[PDB]
């Protein structure tokens, strides 16, 4: 599933992890 809103803080670490790891997301 997908969801942010949480990220709004752009400090979101989970996506942050998946971000530096980009392909890590999907």
């Amino acid at each position: 599933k997908g969801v942010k809103d949480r990220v709004k803080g752009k400090s979101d670490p989970y996506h942050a992890t998946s971000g530096a790891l980009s392909p890590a997301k999907d």
Side-chain angles (χ1 to χ4, degrees), residues 5-26:
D5 189 60
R6 173 205 293 82
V7 77
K8 98 259 71 179
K10 326 302 278 300
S11 182
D12 201 82
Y14 353 58
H15 300 166
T17 221
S18 62
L21 299 180
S22 299
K25 297 179 180 180
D26 300 300

